[PDB]
């Protein structure tokens, strides 16, 4: 604590678009940063993207720069990951990770990871 909140699991099919969420329970979105990390079995954890709420700064890679996109949400306060053109290869556990990096103390609390299945 402080804590990160992601959905347990999401089910999708090839070709569709899915959105995964990352909530802060008791912090300041306007100060900090956000990550999305893909863990597949035996691929380890692969770093994917980033996010900034105001103007923006959601940064990926020239494999992710296409279907993978990140975002924020103000009145509730949430970070987003989008997977457009879902493939069967996109099936994994996606971790979001959450606070500080401004110049204060303490640490992020890694979310619990969203299991994305594709498809059944």
């Amino acid at each position: 604590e402080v804590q990160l909140q992601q959905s347990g699991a999401e089910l999708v099919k090839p070709g569709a678009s899915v959105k995964l969420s990352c909530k802060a329970s008791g912090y300041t979105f306007t100060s900090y940063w956000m990550h999305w990390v893909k863990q597949r079995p035996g691929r380890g954890l692969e770093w994917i993207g980033r996010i900034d709420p105001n103007g923006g700064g959601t940064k990926y890679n020239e494999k992710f720069k296409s279907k993978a996109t990140l975002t924020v949400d103000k009145p509730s306060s949430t970070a987003y990951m989008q997977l457009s053109s879902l493939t069967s290869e996109d099936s994994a556990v996606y971790y979001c990770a959450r606070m500080w990096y401004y110049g204060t103390y303490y640490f992020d609390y890694w979310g619990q990871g969203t299991t994305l299945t594709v498809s059944s």
């Binding site: 909140q5 992601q6 959905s7 347990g8 699991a9 999401e10 619990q112 990871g113 969203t114 299991t115």
Partner: protein
Amino acid sequence: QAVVTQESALTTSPGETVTLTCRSSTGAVTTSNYANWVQEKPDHLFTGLIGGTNNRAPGVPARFSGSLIGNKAALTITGAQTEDEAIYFCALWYSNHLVFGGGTKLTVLE
């Protein structure tokens, strides 16, 4: 279709109180949903804890209780033990069939 959303994992301490939420994608979780809470422990063992929002299975301690909070159903565990470490799934009734969330893994340390 109806999608049910719960947190992926909550870490806790023994003697501490934790809450698990469960939202409907169709709107509010209401009492026509008869919110179900089922503990899963290793080796695919499922045990029904609470049915119809707040009704306990025989011999579930009173430390476990369900309720509706806002637009979501909640499961609250009072005075967590180490034996409470499991995967808690939420299942909602949509007229004639259940729909499950992904399950909230609860870690107790320790």
